[PDB]
Amino acid sequence: SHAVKIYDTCIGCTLCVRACPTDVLEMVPASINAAKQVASSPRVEDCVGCKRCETACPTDFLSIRVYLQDNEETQYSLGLDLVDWS
Amino acid sequence: KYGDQRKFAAVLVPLTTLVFPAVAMGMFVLYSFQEDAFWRIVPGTKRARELDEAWREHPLFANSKDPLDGLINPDDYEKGLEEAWERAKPAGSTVTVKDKLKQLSKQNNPHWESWRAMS
Amino acid sequence: RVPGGKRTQELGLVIPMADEDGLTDGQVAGLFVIALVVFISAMDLAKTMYNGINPAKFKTSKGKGYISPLVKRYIENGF
Amino acid sequence: IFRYINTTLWAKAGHFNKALSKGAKTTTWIWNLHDYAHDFDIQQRSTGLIARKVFSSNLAHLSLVFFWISGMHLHGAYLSNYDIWLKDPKSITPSSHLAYSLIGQDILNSYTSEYFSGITITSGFFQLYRSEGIITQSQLKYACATSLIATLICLSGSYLHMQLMSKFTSFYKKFQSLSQDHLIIIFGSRSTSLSAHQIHKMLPANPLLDSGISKPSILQVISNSLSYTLALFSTNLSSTGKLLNPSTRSVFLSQVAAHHKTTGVVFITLGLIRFLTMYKSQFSILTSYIDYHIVLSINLALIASLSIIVADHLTRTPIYPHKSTSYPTILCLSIHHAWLSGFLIIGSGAHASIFNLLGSPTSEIRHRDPIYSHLIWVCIAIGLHSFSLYCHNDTLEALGRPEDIFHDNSIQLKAIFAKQSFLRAELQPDIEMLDKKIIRITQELGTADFIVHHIHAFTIHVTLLILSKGVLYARNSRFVSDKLELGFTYPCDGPGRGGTCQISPWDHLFSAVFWMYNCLNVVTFHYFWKMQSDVWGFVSIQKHISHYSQGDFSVNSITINGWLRNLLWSEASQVIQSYALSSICPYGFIFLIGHFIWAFSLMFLFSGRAYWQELIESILWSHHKLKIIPHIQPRALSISQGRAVGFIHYTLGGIGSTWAFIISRLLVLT
Amino acid sequence: NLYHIASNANYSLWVKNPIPSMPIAHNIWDPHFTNSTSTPYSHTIITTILI
Amino acid sequence: AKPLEMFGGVDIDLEDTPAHWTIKASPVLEPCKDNKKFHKKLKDELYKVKKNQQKFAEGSAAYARFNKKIKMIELRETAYGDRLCGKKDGLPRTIATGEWNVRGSAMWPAAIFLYIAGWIGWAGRSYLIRTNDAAKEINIDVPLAVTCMASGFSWPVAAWQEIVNGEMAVPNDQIHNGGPWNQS
Amino acid sequence: VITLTENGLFAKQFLSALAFYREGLKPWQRGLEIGMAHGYFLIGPFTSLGPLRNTPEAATVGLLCGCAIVGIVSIGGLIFGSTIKPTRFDKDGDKPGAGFIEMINWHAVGGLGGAGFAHALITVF
Numbered sequence A: 001s002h003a004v005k006i007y008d009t010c011i012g013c014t015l016c017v018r019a020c021p022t023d024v025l026e027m028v029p030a031s032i033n034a035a036k037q038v039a040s041s042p043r044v045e046d047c048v049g050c051k052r053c054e055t056a057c058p059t060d061f062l063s064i065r066v067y068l069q070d071n072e073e074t075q076y077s078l079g080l081d082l083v084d085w086s
Numbered sequence B: 001k002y003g004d005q006r007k008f009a010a011v012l013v014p015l016t017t018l019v020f021p022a023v024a025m026g027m028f029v030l031y032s033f034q035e036d037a038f039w040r041i042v043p044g045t046k047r048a049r050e051l052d053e054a055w056r057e058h059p060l061f062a063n064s065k066d067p068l069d070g071l072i073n074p075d076d077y078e079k080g081l082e083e084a085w086e087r088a089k090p091a092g093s094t095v096t097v098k099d100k101l102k103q104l105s106k107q108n109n110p111h112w113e114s115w116r117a118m119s
Numbered sequence C: 001r002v003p004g005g006k007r008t009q010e011l012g013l014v015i016p017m018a019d020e021d022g023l024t025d026g027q028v029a030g031l032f033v034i035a036l037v038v039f040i041s042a043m044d045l046a047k048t049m050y051n052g053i054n055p056a057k058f059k060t061s062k063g064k065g066y067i068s069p070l071v072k073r074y075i076e077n078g079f
Numbered sequence D: 001i002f003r004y005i006n007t008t009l010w011a012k013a014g015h016f017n018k019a020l021s022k023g024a025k026t027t028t029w030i031w032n033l034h035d036y037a038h039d040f041d042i043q044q045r046s047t048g049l050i051a052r053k054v055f056s057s058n059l060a061h062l063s064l065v066f067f068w069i070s071g072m073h074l075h076g077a078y079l080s081n082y083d084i085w086l087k088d089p090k091s092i093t094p095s096s097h098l099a100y101s102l103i104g105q106d107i108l109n110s111y112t113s114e115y116f117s118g119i120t121i122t123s124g125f126f127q128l129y130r131s132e133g134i135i136t137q138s139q140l141k142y143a144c145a146t147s148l149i150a151t152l153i154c155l156s157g158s159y160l161h162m163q164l165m166s167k168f169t170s171f172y173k174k175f176q177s178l179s180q181d182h183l184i185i186i187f188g189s190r191s192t193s194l195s196a197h198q199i200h201k202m203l204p205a206n207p208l209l210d211s212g213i214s215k216p217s218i219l220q221v222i223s224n225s226l227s228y229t230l231a232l233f234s235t236n237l238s239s240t241g242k243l244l245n246p247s248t249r250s251v252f253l254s255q256v257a258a259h260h261k262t263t264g265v266v267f268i269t270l271g272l273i274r275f276l277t278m279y280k281s282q283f284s285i286l287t288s289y290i291d292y293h294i295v296l297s298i299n300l301a302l303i304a305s306l307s308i309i310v311a312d313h314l315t316r317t318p319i320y321p322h323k324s325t326s327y328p329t330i331l332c333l334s335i336h337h338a339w340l341s342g343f344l345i346i347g348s349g350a351h352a353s354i355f356n357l358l359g360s361p362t363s364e365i366r367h368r369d370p371i372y373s374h375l376i377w378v379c380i381a382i383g384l385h386s387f388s389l390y391c392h393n394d395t396l397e398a399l400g401r402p403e404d405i406f407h408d409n410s411i412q413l414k415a416i417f418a419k420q421s422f423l424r425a426e427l428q429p430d431i432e433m434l435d436k437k438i439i440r441i442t443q444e445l446g447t448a449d450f451i452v453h454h455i456h457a458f459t460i461h462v463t464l465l466i467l468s469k470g471v472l473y474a475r476n477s478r479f480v481s482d483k484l485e486l487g488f489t490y491p492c493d494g495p496g497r498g499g500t501c502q503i504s505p506w507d508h509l510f511s512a513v514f515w516m517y518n519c520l521n522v523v524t525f526h527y528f529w530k531m532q533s534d535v536w537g538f539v540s541i542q543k544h545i546s547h548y549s550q551g552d553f554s555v556n557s558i559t560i561n562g563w564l565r566n567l568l569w570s571e572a573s574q575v576i577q578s579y580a581l582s583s584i585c586p587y588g589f590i591f592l593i594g595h596f597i598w599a600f601s602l603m604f605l606f607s608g609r610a611y612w613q614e615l616i617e618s619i620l621w622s623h624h625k626l627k628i629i630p631h632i633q634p635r636a637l638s639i640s641q642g643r644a645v646g647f648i649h650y651t652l653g654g655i656g657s658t659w660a661f662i663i664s665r666l667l668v669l670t
Numbered sequence E: 001n002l003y004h005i006a007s008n009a010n011y012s013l014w015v016k017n018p019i020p021s022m023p024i025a026h027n028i029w030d031p032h033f034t035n036s037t038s039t040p041y042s043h044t045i046i047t048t049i050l051i
Numbered sequence F: 001a002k003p004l005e006m007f008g009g010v011d012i013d014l015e016d017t018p019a020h021w022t023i024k025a026s027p028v029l030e031p032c033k034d035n036k037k038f039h040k041k042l043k044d045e046l047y048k049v050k051k052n053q054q055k056f057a058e059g060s061a062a063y064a065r066f067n068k069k070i071k072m073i074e075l076r077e078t079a080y081g082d083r084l085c086g087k088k089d090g091l092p093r094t095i096a097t098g099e100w101n102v103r104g105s106a107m108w109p110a111a112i113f114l115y116i117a118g119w120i121g122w123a124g125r126s127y128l129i130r131t132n133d134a135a136k137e138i139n140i141d142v143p144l145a146v147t148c149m150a151s152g153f154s155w156p157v158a159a160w161q162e163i164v165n166g167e168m169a170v171p172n173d174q175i176h177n178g179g180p181w182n183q184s
Numbered sequence G: 001v002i003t004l005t006e007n008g009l010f011a012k013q014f015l016s017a018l019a020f021y022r023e024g025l026k027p028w029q030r031g032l033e034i035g036m037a038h039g040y041f042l043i044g045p046f047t048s049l050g051p052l053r054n055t056p057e058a059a060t061v062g063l064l065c066g067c068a069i070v071g072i073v074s075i076g077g078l079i080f081g082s083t084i085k086p087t088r089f090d091k092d093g094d095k096p097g098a099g100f101i102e103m104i105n106w107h108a109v110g111g112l113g114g115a116g117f118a119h120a121l122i123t124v125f
C-alpha cells in the first residue's frame, strides 16, 4: 500500500476526490480555509498510485502527496485482475 | 604430456557449470517459498519481528527508536517549556503545554507499517 | 593453432606449449584441500552474515562478554 | 458566402483549438499548436466544418502532388540529359538533377554524358517518359504545363470547397455514390482511357524506337500518322510475360495496353455487378464503419498493401523499357515502395485505434484476449524459431562444426511451397539478358531464402501484434478500466499499479513504428543482397554468369556473421570510401549524417522530460539573473512529444543510413 | 590466476623467449567443440589453449 | 643527445629565447609554399579535377565550369602559400595563440564573431526588456524588433555601462534560487 | 465464455478423458501414462538431427538425452509439488501434495519406460 498524505495547504477543491479512480479520498469538515473543508485519505489501501489526485490539485505545491512504496505493494495497490491474493 | 589435466576438467567443468548451477536454482526456488525468504528486504517476515524485539530487549537499545530519546531529565525540560509558554501565552488562551504536546504527538496515520500484522 | 590477426602472421608470433604436465595431480589435490577449507569457511561466513548479530544472546549464552583493554581505551579516547 | 474568408485569423495562431485560446503562456503551447493543426475532429465548430476541412485539405494535398509532378517534368525538360539517354539508355545514367558550383559542391555532379554532369537520379522517371512516348523537349514542356494547370485547379478547388460545402452538405456521406462512381469512372473508364493513350501514342512510338529509328524521321513518323503499323504489331504470339521485348528488356507495350483495356472492362463490369452481388454479411461492417478515421485506416492499409505489391512487381515483372538493366532504378523502385507500405500500414493501425476511441468498435474486441494472446504465442514461436536458426548456424560455425548448421550443404530446410510455386512466371528454362546485364533470372530458393522468409513473417507478426494490441485495448483493459476517458494519446495513467507508462494506442503506434522499421530493414537487406548475389550482374559469352556479389547469399546469409561481413561491411566499402569521388560524395556524407541522427534520437528515446525540465529551470535561473525573461515560459518537451521526436529521428537516421549504403554501392557498381 | 598460470599455461617457456612468444591464460575444455579434426586453438592433437 | 630518439620521435626546441614564442618558429610547422606535402596534395587535387574535366566534351559548359574550378584550386594553392602547415601533413594550420599578425590566425574571426554575437544577444535582451509580455513574443512588434536590432551595435559599451551601474545583473534574492534542500 | 474448442461436447469429453483428468485413475496410473507418452516422444528429437545423429549408434545417445529430459522435467515437477503442493490428487487424510508427488515419480518411471521402448523399437526395427 502507498502513503497518501493531505497537508494544511488544502483549500477544499474536491478535485482530488473526484479524480481518484478507487475512492481513496474524501472530504471532511475543517476550519483552516474559506471552504471549511479539507481532503482526507481514509482508504489508501485502495490507492493504486495513479497520482491523478496530484494532477488535479491546484495549490502551489500539492496539498495532497502520494508516496510510492514498491516494496509494499498489495493486490489492491497493484490492480491485480487475473490473480487473487486473498 | 601437456594434457592429463583434462582429467580434472572433465569432472569439474560439468560439475560446477551444470550440477551446481541446477542445484543452486532448485534450492533458490525452494527457498523462495519459505516464510523466512528474503526476510531482510521483504516486509512482514517473522524473523524481522523477532530481530527487532531482540534488539529492543537489549538494555542499551530499549529506547533507541524514539526520536525524542536523549532528554536526561525530561521533567526539567517540560517544566522549563511550560514556564516559557506561560509568559508568552496569548491573552486568555486555554491551551496548556502538556495537552498541546500530547495532541501534537498523536497523529492519524492508520496505514503506516500495517504490514506488521501477518508474520 | 590457426592464427588470426595481421600481426601474428606477419611477425611469426608463436605460442609455446610445455611438453610436460605443469602441476602433478598431488599438487592439484593439495590446492583443492585448502580450496575446500576456504569453501567451508565461506559458507559459514555467509550463514553468519545472513542471520546477522543476535543481541538477545546475553539472556541465554554463557559467559559474561568481554571488552579488550585496548577497546575500552579506544572508547574513551574519543571518536 | 466568401465574405467570411478573412485573414483576421492568420495573426491569431491557435484559433482552431479552444484549448489554445488561453494564449502562449509556455513553450508547450507551440508544440500543441503544431500537433492539433490537422486534427480537424477536435477543432472548434460543427461537424460540417470537419467535412469541409477534410475535403479541401485532400484537394490541397492533391495540388501539392501535382506541383511535385510538374517540378519533375520541368527538371526533365530543362535540367536533364534525357536526350542522350533516349539515344543510348544503356550507356547513360539518368540525371535530371544538378548541383550549383558553391562550397565545392561541384564535386557532386558526375559524368553521366559527354555533355552533361549531374546527380544520377534513381526515380525511374526517364523510363516512365520513354514508356510514355515522350521524345521531344516540347512534350515535357506541355506535361509540366498541364501539371501546373492541375496544381492551380486543385488549389482553387480546395479554396472554393471551404465555402461551397455548407452545413447541409452530404455528398461525402453518400458511400454508394462514391464507390460506384470511383470504381466505374476511374478504375474502369480511366483504365480504358490509358489503354487508348498507349494504343494511339506508345505503339505508334515505342516500336519505332525499338525498330532502331531513334530518328523516327523526326516528326514525320513519330508525330503519329502511323496507322500502317497495326496495334498488335510485335506481340509474337507467346504469353504476356513469358517472352520479353529483346530490345528494351520489358513486356511489350501492346500487351500492357491490352492489360489496361481488359482491366478497365473488368472494373466497369464489377461496377455493374455491384447492383446485385454478395452482401448482408459485411453489412455490420457497412453500418459501423461510416466514419472518417475508420475509412482512413482502411484506405491506408489498402494503399500500403498495394504499395508492397508494386514493390515486388516492379522488379522482376519488367514493364518499363530499359529499366531492368538500370539496377539502381530497380532497387529504388522496390525499396521506396516497401518503406511506404510499412509506414502506411502503421498509419492504418493508428487510425484504427483512433476510430475505436472515437466511434464504437465491433464484435471482435470482446474476445480480444484470445486474439492478442495467440498472436503473442505465434510471435514468440516464430521468433524463437526463425532467428535462432541463424543463432544455431552462427554458434556451430564458430565451433567449427559446419555439418551441423542449417545450410544447403548441411541440414537443409527446403522451401517446399516456393519450390513448388513455379506457377508464377512459369518462364522457359533459361535466363534473359540485354547488354552485358541480366534482365531477370529465376531466384533459386534454398535454405537461406526459407530462413529469411520466416524472419520476415516473424517481424510482420510482431508489428501486427503491437498494432492489434493497441487497437483492441484502446477503450479499456484489465490494467486500466477507463482508458476511453484518457483520450487517444496520453503519456500514461501514472506510476501506480506498478507503472502505467505507454498504455495509450499512440504509444502502441510508437513501438509499432520501431518494429515496422526493423521488419522491412530486413526486407531491404534480403532484397539488396539476394538480387546482387543471384540475379543482377555481368555475363560471359560462354553462358556463364558473374553476379555482383559472386553468389555470397547462399553461403553467407545462413549466419548473422555472414550478414555483418558480406553485406554491412564488404558491400559498404563503396559508401565508406566515397570521399572525393565525384558521384558518391553526398552518399558518404549522408551515411555519416544518418548515423549521427540515429544516435541523436537515443537522447529523446532513453531520457524522461523531468531531467530536461530541471536543467531548463537551472538555465532559466541564469537568464533571469541578467534580466532576460522569456514570457513564453521554457518547458521541456511533453512525454508524448519526446517519444515522437525520438521515433522520428531514429527512423529518419536509419533510413538515411540504408539509403546511402544501397544507393552509393549500386551507383558505383553500375 | 596464479594456479592457472602454474598448471594450464607455459610460463616456464614464455620466460625464456618473451618477445615473440605468447602466454597462455588457461586450457579450453568445452564439449561443444569438434570431437574430430583440430580446433584453431590447439596444435593438432595437443590440448586447447587461450592466449 | 638527439632529443628526437630520446622522446620517441617528437623534437624539443631546447632554446629559451622570446623570439621562439611565435608559432612561426615551431619546428613542427613550415610555410606551405615550401612544403612537399602541400605541393603533392594540391597537385593531386589539380590532377583529379583535370582528369574529370577531360572526360567531358571540349566545347561543353561542363568543360568551362571545370576550367573555373581549376582556376579556383590554383588560386587556393597560391593564397595558402603564406599559411603555416605541418612538416608532415601539408594541411595549413590555424593559429590560436593570440598572435594577431599571422596568416590563418583565430584572433580576427574571434573578434568579429564576439562582436556580432554580443550584438544578437543584446538586441534580444533589449527587445525582451522593452516587451514585458508573452503576447509580444508570439506576435513580434516588428518596428520595435528592428529598432532593437539596429540599436544593438553599441552593445560593447552599453552592456558594460549597465554592468557597472547595476542594471544588468539582479540580486539572487529576487529570482527563484531553485528547489528547497531543507526545512524540517 | 463458452467456445467450441473448450466447451463443446467433444472438447469437454477429450479434456476430461486425459490422463491428468480421467476419472477412476490412481495417481501412479496418470503419471505412468503421461510419462510413457513423454519418454516415447522425447527420443526422436535427439536420435535424429542430434550431435551424434550419423554415428553407428545414434540412438543410445538419443535414449540418454530423452531420459535426461524426462528426469529434468520430473525434478521440476517435484519442485512444484514441494512448493505449490497441489492437493487435487491427494486422497482424504494424507500428507498434502502426496498424490502429485506420486504422479510425478511415476511420470519419471513412465518416461524411462517409454524412452526405452522407443529405443528398443528403433534398434530392433
Ligand code: CLA
Residues within 6 Å of the ligand: D034, D035, D036, D037, D038, D039, D040, D296, D300, D343, D344, D346, D347, D348, D350, D354, D488, D489, D506, D509, D513, D648, D652
Ligand atoms: C493519408 C494519410 C494520413 C492522414 C490524412 C492523417 C491524418 C491525421 N493523423 Mg495520421 N498518420 C499517418 C497518415 C495520415 N494521418 C501515418 C502513415 C502514420 C504513421 C506514422 C500516422 C500516425 C499518426 C499519429 C501517431 C497521430 C496521427 C494524428 C493524425 C490527425 C492529426 C494530425 C496532425 O495534426 O498532425 C500535424 C502534422 C504534423 C505534426 C507533421 C509534422 C511532420 C512529421 C511529424 C515529421 C516528418 C519528418 C519528415 C518526413 C522528414 C523531414 C526531412 C528531413 C531531411 C528534415 C489527423 C486526423 C494524430 C491524432 O491525434 O489523430 C487524431 C496522432 O496522434 N497520425
Ligand SMILES: CC1=C(/C=C/C(C)=C/C=C/C(C)=C/C=C/C=C(C)/C=C/C=C(C)/C=C/C2=C(C)CCCC2(C)C)C(C)(C)CCC1
Residues within 6 Å of the ligand: G032, G036, G037, G038, G040, G041, G109, G110, G112, G113, G114, G116, G117
Ligand atoms: C501429427 C498429428 C497429430 C498429433 C499426433 C500426436 C500428438 C501423436 C503423439 C503420439 C505419441 C506421443 C505416442 C506415444 C506413444 C507412447 C508409447 C506407445 C509408449 C509406450 C511405453 C511403454 C510400453 C513402456 C513400458 C515400460 C514401462 C511403463 C516402464 C518399465 C519399462 C517398460 C518399457 C516395460 C494431430 C492429431 C494433432 C493432427 C495431425 C497428425
Ligand SMILES: CC1=C(C/C=C(\C)CCC[C@H](C)CCC[C@H](C)CCCC(C)C)C(=O)c2ccccc2C1=O
Residues within 6 Å of the ligand: D603, D604, D605, D607, D608, D609, D612, D613, D635, D636, D637, D638, D639, D641, D642, D643
Ligand atoms: C533533449 C531533450 C529535451 C530538451 C529538448 C528540447 C526542449 C528541444 C527544443 C530545442 C529547440 C527549440 C529545437 C529547435 C531546433 C534546434 C535549435 C536546431 C535544429 C536544427 C539545427 C541542425 C540547425 C526534452 O524536452 C525531452 C522531453 C522528453 C523526453 C526527452 C527529451 C530530450 O531528450
Ligand code: SF4
Residues within 6 Å of the ligand: A006, A009, A010, A011, A012, A013, A014, A015, A016, A017, A038, A039, A053, A056, A057, A058, A059, A062, A063, A064
Ligand atoms: S485537489 Fe488539492 S487543494 Fe483541492 S481539495 Fe484536493 S487536496 Fe485540497
Ligand code: SF4
Residues within 6 Å of the ligand: A004, A019, A020, A021, A022, A023, A024, A025, A046, A047, A048, A049, A050, A051, A052, A053, A054, A066, D496
Ligand atoms: S494516487 Fe490515484 S488512487 Fe491513489 S489517492 Fe491519488 S488519485 Fe486516488
Ligand code: SF4
Residues within 6 Å of the ligand: D491, D492, D493, D494, D495, D496, D499, D500, D501, D502, D608, D639
Ligand atoms: S515514468 Fe513517465 S510515462 Fe511512466 S508512469 Fe511516470 S510519468 Fe508516466
